[PDB]
Amino acid sequence: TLFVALYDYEARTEDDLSFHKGEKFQILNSSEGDWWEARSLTTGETGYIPSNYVAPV
Numbered sequence: 001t002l003f004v005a006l007y008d009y010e011a012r013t014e015d016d017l018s019f020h021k022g023e024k025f026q027i028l029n030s031s032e033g034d035w036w037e038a039r040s041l042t043t044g045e046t047g048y049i050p051s052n053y054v055a056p057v
């Protein structure tokens, strides 16, 4: 399942990942809590994204 960003998000540090609304992600870890480790299908960048900012495609 891919996930798609509902809103733009600007990351605070190198650990979280900035993204634009409509960006799609493949999710690598969702089991660690509510920030999921994800790779952007736009750029390939990988980092934590807030799981409440994305929805399944």
Ligand code: NA
Pocket (backbone or CB within 6 Å): 011, 012, 013, 014, 015, 016, 017, 018, 047
């Ligand atoms: Na970042």
Ligand code: NA
Pocket (backbone or CB within 6 Å): 051, 052, 053, 054, 055, 056
């Ligand atoms: Na969500």
